[PDB]
Design a protein around this ligand. Structure first.
Ligand SMILES: Nc1ncnc2c1ncn2[C@@H]1O[C@H](COP(=O)(O)OP(=O)(O)O)[C@@H](O)[C@H]1O
Ligand SMILES: *[C@@H]1O[C@H](CO)[C@@H](O)[C@H](O)[C@H]1NC(C)=O
Length: 245
């Protein structure tokens, strides 16, 4: 399992949690020095448990699919909550079995779907460590509209930070003050699958992308990624989604 405590959290402790999260995800190999997530994991081993504590010491346990860093669901006290998607229904056979009831949320974990359910796009939802304290507090007691926003904050501050060093650093900057995501943050989230595919295909194409990827850089400017010598590949991306997925 991995843990993060918002009480006494600072940029260093958040960075330690994200390092813990990345290191709990299994890989058999690296592509251009980046861990390659497994194509598949059978049974309970497919799920990682993340224990998150708000400033007040109240806790949720979040279940994460180690193939893609997707959040399946979470446990608050004696109630489990799962996204409305087949992988989450399967997860509910393995995790949070002892919960008194299991609520299926009225949406999948798809960003477009969560944004419709929250009533706001990611572009307008502040993120940061105080936002994560709020999100844990929201998820402790069911409110599906409130939960959609909380889950967009939770996914970006856990899974997306694990996938990109830049997003980790953006949340560290927001340790004590929330701010809507940077243009480069939204770009990287939207491009993880694409970048993962192009990095794996660059094995066999001399480190050249078969299809260049258009990103936003840390200054807010267009950068076109054509090959593996780019900073996005050498420093930023930390996990590759397997092209089998
Ligand atoms: N359960 C989930 N948890 C976290 N992020 C998710 C989840 N489901 C979808 N996403 C995100 O939403 C976007 C679209 O994903 P998507 O193509 O819908 O995957 P899938 O088809 O398996 O649901 C991606 O940015 C993706 O990372
Ligand atoms: C490869 O990507 C880098 C980005 O750092 C760029 O400088 C270079 O022009 C690209 N193309 C080739 C052919 O290396």
């Amino acid at each position: 399992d991995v843990s993060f405590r918002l009480s006494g959290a600072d940029p260093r402790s958040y960075g330690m949690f994200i390092k813990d999260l990345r290191n709990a995800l299994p890989f058999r190999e690296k592509v251009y020095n980046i861990p390659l997530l497994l194509p598949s994991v059978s049974g309970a081993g497919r799920y990682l448990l993340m224990h998150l504590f708000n400033y007040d010491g109240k806790t949720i346990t979040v279940a994460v699919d180690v193939t893609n860093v997707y959040i399946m669901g979470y446990l608050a006290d004696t109630t489990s909550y799962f996204f409305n998607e087949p992988a989450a229904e399967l997860a509910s056979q393995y995790v949070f079995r002892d919960a008194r009831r299991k609520i299926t949320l009225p949406y999948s974990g798809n960003y477009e779907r969560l944004q419709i359910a929250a009533g706001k796009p990611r572009e307008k939802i502040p993120i940061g460590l105080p936002a994560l304290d709020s999100a844990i507090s929201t998820l402790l007691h069911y409110d599906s509209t409130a939960a959609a926003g909380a889950l967009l904050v939770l996914i970006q501050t856990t899974a997306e930070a694990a996938r990109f060093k830049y997003i980790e650093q953006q949340i560290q900057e927001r340790a004590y003050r929330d701010e809507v995501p940077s243009l480069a943050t939204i770009s990287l989230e939207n491009s993880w699958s694409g970048l993962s595919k192009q990095i794996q295909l660059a094995q066999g194409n001399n480190g050249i992308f078969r299809t260049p990827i258009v990103l936003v850089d840390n200054k807010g400017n267009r950068v076109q990624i054509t090959n593996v010598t780019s900073k996005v590949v050498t420093s930023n991306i930390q996990l590759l989604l397997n092209t089998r997925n």
